[PDB]
Design a protein around this ligand. Structure first.
Ligand SMILES: O=C1C(=O)N(Cc2cccc(O)c2)[C@H]2CNC[C@@H]2N1Cc1cccc(O)c1
Ligand SMILES: [Cl-]
Ligand SMILES: [Cl-]
Ligand SMILES: [Cl-]
Lengths: 99, 99
């Protein structure tokens, strides 16, 4: 699809068998999702936000659907204001910026 | 142009007679620039996300040139670690997400 930016670019994702709303965020290096259960071992990760740094949990090779497009990759879990699909997965689904 | 997301989508902007590097950020509602002088009245605002909030100065009707495209809108100025072009200006240059 082509998504304009007059409103927040919110889409539906599927992760852990559940539908969630998430923001397509080209300003985010990484994908971060609100607290939920994911399989496997995790590693620590620091995000640098506009207001400061924050530590989250990194899960690798997680299955996730974004607007119906299947992806498998790194998902961070922590206290994000909104679920964020960052560049790591935007690249997987072939998303570009155009003007 | 078409901009892939393998790396941060940084572009050159011209604002207030100055050249700066800024991030095209579809997850940002607003545009926020590091400390600099801008003309006109301003009012204080708080903007935030995963790492906390920062206090910024809101300037309205500011002309910017983003990667060669002129636009006008509100620009926030404050202690942001990265210059951010948000949706309020991305729309004006015709920027969309495509996949
Ligand atoms: O921390 C923030 C942040 O505060 N904002 C909000 C913001 C920032 C500037 C202006 C505005 O109106 C809103 C977000 C927006 N996209 C990534 C901005 N980030 C960075 C981020 C987020 C998640 C994962 C990452 O790897 C990086
Ligand atoms: Cl990944
Ligand atoms: Cl505006
Ligand atoms: Cl449009």
């Amino acid at each position: 699809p082509q998504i304009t930016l007059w409103k927040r670019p919110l889409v539906t994702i599927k992760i852990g068998g559940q539908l969630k709303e998430a923001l397509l965020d080209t300003g985010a290096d990484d994908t971060v999702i609100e607290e939920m259960s994911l399989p496997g071992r995790w590693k620590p990760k620091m995000i640098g936000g506009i207001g400061g740094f924050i530590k989250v949990r990194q899960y690798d090779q997680i299955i996730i659907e974004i607007c119906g497009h299947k992806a498998i990759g790194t998902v961070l879990v922590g206290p994000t204001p909104v679920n964020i699909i960052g560049r790591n997965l935007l690249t997987q689904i072939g998303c570009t910026l155009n003007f």
